[PDB]
Amino acid sequence: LLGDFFRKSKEKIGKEFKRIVQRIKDFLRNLV
Amino acid sequence: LLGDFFRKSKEKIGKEFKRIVQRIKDFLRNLVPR
């Protein structure tokens, strides 16, 4: 399972960078 | 809570980079013939 550890740590970091992008788009739409 | 959202998201990303460094140090020690 060492190769299974390196694959699942990367998927986790990519999923949090995507939650930051959607919050910025909601603030700027709420002002109109 | 907008300023509380940005502070807690940075803390979470730094904790995962530190788990990767400790797993690499444990592989290299276990090879010693002794």
Side-chain angles (χ1 to χ4, degrees), chain A residues 13, chain B residues 11 13-23:
Chain A
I13 296 170
Chain B
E11 277 174 27
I13 296 170
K15 274 205 278 284
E16 268 298 300
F17 279 110
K18 290 162 120 95
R19 289 182 193 109
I20 300 168
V21 172
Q22 191 61 254
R23 190 59 98 101

Side-chain angles (χ1 to χ4, degrees), chain A residues 21-32, chain B residues 2 6:
Chain A
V21 174
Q22 292 305 328
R23 193 62 190 261
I24 298 168
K25 285 182 167 152
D26 299 347
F27 174 64
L28 296 185
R29 183 178 203 238
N30 255 226
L31 293 175
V32 183
Chain B
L2 198 65
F6 296 135

Side-chain angles (χ1 to χ4, degrees), chain B:
Chain B
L1 89 339
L2 198 65
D4 305 294
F5 177 83
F6 296 135
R7 192 212 323 123
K8 290 171 149 203
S9 78
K10 167 200 296 271
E11 277 174 27
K12 216 132 65 120
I13 296 170
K15 274 205 278 284
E16 268 298 300
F17 279 110
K18 290 162 120 95
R19 289 182 193 109
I20 300 168
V21 172
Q22 191 61 254
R23 190 59 98 101
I24 297 166
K25 282 185 167 156
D26 295 2
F27 177 67
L28 299 186
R29 187 172 32 150
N30 277 354
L31 293 175
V32 180
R34 191 229 171 280

